[PDB]
Design a protein around this nucleic acid. Sequence first.
RNA 1: UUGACCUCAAAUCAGGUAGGACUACGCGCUGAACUUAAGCAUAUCAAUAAGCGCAGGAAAAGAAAAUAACCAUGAUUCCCUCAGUAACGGCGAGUGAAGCGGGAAAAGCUCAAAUUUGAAAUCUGGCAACAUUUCUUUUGUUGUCCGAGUUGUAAUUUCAA
RNA 2: UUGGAUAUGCCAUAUAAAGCGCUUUCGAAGAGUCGAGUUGUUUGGGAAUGCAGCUCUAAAUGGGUGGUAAAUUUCAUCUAA
RNA 3: GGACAUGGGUUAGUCGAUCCUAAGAGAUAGGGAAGCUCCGUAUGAAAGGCACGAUUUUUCGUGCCUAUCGAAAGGG
RNA 4: CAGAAGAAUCAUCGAAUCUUUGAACGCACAUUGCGCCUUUGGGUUCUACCAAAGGCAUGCCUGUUUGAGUGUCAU
Lengths: 120, 104, 121, 354
Amino acid sequence: AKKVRTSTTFRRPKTLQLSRKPKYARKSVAHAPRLDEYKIIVNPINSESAMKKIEDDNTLVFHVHLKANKFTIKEAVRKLYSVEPVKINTLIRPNGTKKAFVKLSADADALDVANRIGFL
Amino acid sequence: KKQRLVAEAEAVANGKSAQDVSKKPYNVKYGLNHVVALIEAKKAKLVLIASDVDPIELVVFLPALCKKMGVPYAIVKNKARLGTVIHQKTAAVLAVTEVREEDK
Amino acid sequence: ALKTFELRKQSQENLAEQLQELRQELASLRVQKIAGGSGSKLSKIKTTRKDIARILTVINESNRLAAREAYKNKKYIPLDLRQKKTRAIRRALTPYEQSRKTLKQIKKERYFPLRKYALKA
Amino acid sequence: ARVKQKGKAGAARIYITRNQALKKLQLTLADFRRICILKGVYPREPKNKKKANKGSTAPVTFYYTKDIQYLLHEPIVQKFREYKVFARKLSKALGKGELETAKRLEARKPTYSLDHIIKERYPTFHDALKDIDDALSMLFLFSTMPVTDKIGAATVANCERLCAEFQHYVIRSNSLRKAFLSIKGIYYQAEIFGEQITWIVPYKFAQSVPTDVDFRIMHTFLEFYQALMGFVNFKLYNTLGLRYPPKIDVNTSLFSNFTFFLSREVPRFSLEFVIRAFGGKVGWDITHHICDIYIQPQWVYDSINKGILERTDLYACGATLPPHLSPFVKEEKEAKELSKMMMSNKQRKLYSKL
RNA sequence: UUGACCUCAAAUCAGGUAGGACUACGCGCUGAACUUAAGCAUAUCAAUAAGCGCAGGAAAAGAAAAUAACCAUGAUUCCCUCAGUAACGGCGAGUGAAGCGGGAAAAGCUCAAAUUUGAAAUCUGGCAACAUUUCUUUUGUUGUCCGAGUUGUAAUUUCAA
RNA sequence: UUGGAUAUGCCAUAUAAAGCGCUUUCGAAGAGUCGAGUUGUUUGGGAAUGCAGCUCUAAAUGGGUGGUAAAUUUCAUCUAA
RNA sequence: GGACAUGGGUUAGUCGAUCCUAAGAGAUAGGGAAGCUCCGUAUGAAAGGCACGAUUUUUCGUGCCUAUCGAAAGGG
RNA sequence: CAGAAGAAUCAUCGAAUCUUUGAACGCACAUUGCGCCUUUGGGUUCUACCAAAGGCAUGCCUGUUUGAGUGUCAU
C-alpha cells in the first residue's frame, strides 16, 4: 500500500512529546511568597497633603513596595486593615519610592482607620 | 547461559562431575575477526556473507579469502537475518564449522 | 529576645503564627517611628527585625533537614542539597575511579610491589 | 490594557472540544475514550455552543478543560504507554523467534490498578453502592454468554466469582426485596444500606454474538466494574467478618417450612436464588412439585410481592393468569386562555406533556 | 501484510556536560612597524608588540624512527659548561645552536595489529536492596530488568619483547 | 583530624594467578603516512633545519638518521606515521 | 534669587509608552573563517496546524493547508 | 547622641538568606515591555478577575520514547 501524496511537500511528522518527569526536584524547598502584605505596605504617609486627603477624600496614603501593583495593594489593605478600598491610585515619587492613594468606601471612615493604624 | 552456569554451580556445590555433566556446544560461529580466523585455520565448513555490509571493505576480501583457502561461501541477503540467527541486530558474516550427524 | 533553641523545639505552624505576629509588630513599630516614637520603640525595631530573621532561619533549616531526610539514600537529590565545594571538584575523578586499574596492573602490583629494604654498613 | 481579543475567556476558555482534548492529552481516540470510561468524564454542552466554539457553528462535543487538565496527571496514561512499549517488545521477540524472552515478557506484562480511580470516582462507599446497578447488569449479562475470541475466559471466571459472592451476600442478608418477570428477563430489586439496586438477569439460553457491538467498550467497562465489585464485596465481607474470597462453589421464614424440589424443566439458576433469597429450602435433581398441590411459577412471585402466600386455585397448572403487574410501576376556558404577552414565560409545554 | 535492520529526525523525554571571568607563569595560532645597518630594498628589530584560541597549580616535554664513531652512552625537564663556539649573514650591520662532561631530580609504562570460540568471559542506565561519607551534601557494592557490544567489549601480548 | 606500621577479629573458591628456565620453533608491530618534487614560511642548519600548501606516492630486514647534492656498496644506531 | 538650608510635591480603563509595521536591524537553516567572528532572513530546513471517527488487530487511523527588534511626530 | 540590658560596629565560620541583572537561559529591552506551561490559593465578586509557587535558551553526549524513508531485506 503506497501512500498517496497530494501536497508535493513533505512536512515533518508529529511525534509524541512526553512531559517532564524528573527523578529529583531541582529545588528542595519552594520559596515563600516573595511579596506578602507586610512587604507590600511599607508605611503610611502623614504629611499635610496626606492628612487633607484623609479628612476630605476618604483616602489613605501609603508608602508601598515598588513591585506592588493596584491589585496587590487592595488585597494587602483588605487583609491588613479589614477595610475594602473602592479605588487605588499609584505614583512613583522622585525619590524612587511608590506611593498609593487608597480611596475607601462610604462604608468605611478613613479618619477612623487612620486612628487604628496609629499614625493620625 | 545463566541457567546452565547456575545448574553447574549447584552441581559443583553437590560435588559431582561438572566437566562431564555438560556437552560440547553445537552452534553457528559469528564475529568478523573470529570467522576470518576460522577460515584461515581451515575450520570453517560454510561461510555466509551479508550482502550489504555498509563499509564494504569489511567483507570485500572474504570471497577471495575463502576461494584461496577452499572454504565454501555464499553471499546471503541482508545483515539482519544473520543477526537474528545469532541473537543480534547485525552480523556481517556467519560461519558453520561443526554440525550434528543428522544434519551432515 | 527570641532564642533559637526554643525556636527550634517547636512546630512549623506555631512558628508561622510567631512570624506573622512579629511582622505585624514591626509594622506597628514603623508606624510609631513615622508618627514620632521614643528611642525604646526605635530600638525594638531592630530587635523585632532580628527576631524575624531568627524565625525565618529556623523554618528554612527545618525545611531543608526534612528535604535531606526525604532524599536520604537517593541516587539523585536536589542541586542545592548536593555538595558545593567548587565546580572543578565536582567535575574531577572520584578516588574510587582514580584508583581503578587493569588486571594487568593488579597482577604486577600483587606479585612485585615496592619492597621495604635496607643496606648493611 | 490593550483591546482583549474575543474567544480568550469564558465559555471559550472553560470548554474544550474532543479533538483539541486529544491533542492536549497526546492520546488516541480509543485511549482517550478508555480513560473517560475509567474516570468520570462525559461531554458537557455549553449554554452558548457557538460562543464556546470561538464563533464556529459546526456540531461539537465539549468537555470541561478542568476535566482534561486533570487527565494530564493520570498515572493510567503512562501505563498505556508502557503497554505499547511492551507490545512492541513482545512483537519484536516473536518476529526474531525469541520464544523464551516472549514468555518472560508475557510474565512481566505491565498491568495497572484501579484502586485510585475507584476512590476518586466514588469518594463514599454509599456513592459506590448507589452506582452499582449498571455494574451488576453488565456482569450478570456477560456471565451467561459463551466465551469467544473477544471475551477472555479468565474475565468470565472473575465475573462468575463476583456475581456468586454478591448473590450469596444477598442470600445471607435477606436483602432481596422484589423480583419482576419481563420479556427482557428478570429484574431483581434489593436493598442494602438504604440504597436500592435493580439489575436484570437474562435467561440461561444458547444465544449468539450480535456482531454489531464493540466489545472493547464492554472490556473497559467490565474491567472497571470487576475492580469495583472486588473492592465493594471485600468491604462487605470484612464488615460482617467472613473470609473473602469465599471458597463456596456457588418475612425471613416465608418458605422455611417448605422443602422445594426442582425438576428439569424450570430455570433452576434463578429459582434457587429467589427461593433461598427468602430462606427457603431447595433440593435439585416433598411438599410442592414444581412443573410447568400443583401451582404455577407466578404464584410464588405474586406471593413474595404481596408478602403473603397467594391462592392456589388462581395459579393451578393450566388455569388463567391475571396480568403480571410490575411493582416498579407506580373558569377552565379563561384559565387555559390567559396567555398575555409573556413569550418565554409561557410554560404550556408542561400542560402539553404532563 | 506485518516484521527485522540501517540511516536520519523529534521531545520542557531520563541523567549529564560546554561557554564567562582570570591570564604573572603554560601550549598554540596570527603577526607588524618604529629601530639598526650612520641612506636603503635582503637582513636587524623579531619567529617580538598588538590581535585570537586553549590550560594548569605548574604547564609543556617524556620512556629514543636519541646520540655518537667511544673501552661507547641511554626517557624528559632545568642548571653550569660546551659557547659568543660550529654555522648563518648586501659574509655588512648582525645573528647563532648541539653531542659530550659536571650537577638538581629521577619512574616507569599503555594500546592497535592474536580465535575466549567448550561458551561477551565486558560495560552504561532503570529498579530494589544494603553499605559508606570531610558530607543526611560524599562514594560504592550486590541482585534483577532494559539496553550497548561480534562492523569486537574483557582476559592475554607491546619488541626491553 | 590525617599517615605508615602493630595487635588480633572477620571475609576471602588458588578449581587461580605469576616470575624464572629451554625451545631447531614462531614472532601479527600503526599509509594520502614515510619519502620525493615544488612553493611559502621558518632555523645556526649552509645542495631545505622544522612546519605548511600543492603534485606524485613507497616498502618489507623493510623504514628512518649518520649535519655537501648524486649513483653505488658497506657499517653503525634507532624502530615514525 | 534657578544660590544655601529644611521639608513638601507629579494620583489615568479613556493622555502617551506598551500594539503595529517603515527604512533598517537581527537570530535560526546553512556556508565561510586559524580565529575574534563573517555572510545569510522561507534560503539547498523534516522550519505546524486544523478537522472527522459506536474504540482502530483496546500498539490511530482518514482527510485538508515567514522569528524578533525597530515611530512618546506614522497606523491606532 | 539616643537607647536598651551570654553583651559586642567582637572574632571565627562547616548552617542559611543572597533583590534587579550579568556567560545569563521563555522573547525582549533608551519600554519594571511581551508571552506560554503546570499546580495551588484568594474573595461582597467565583465560566470572570487576581495572586503565589514551580517551570519554558542553544550546542553536544548516554539512554528512553515517538517516528520518517521508491534505504536493505525477510515474510
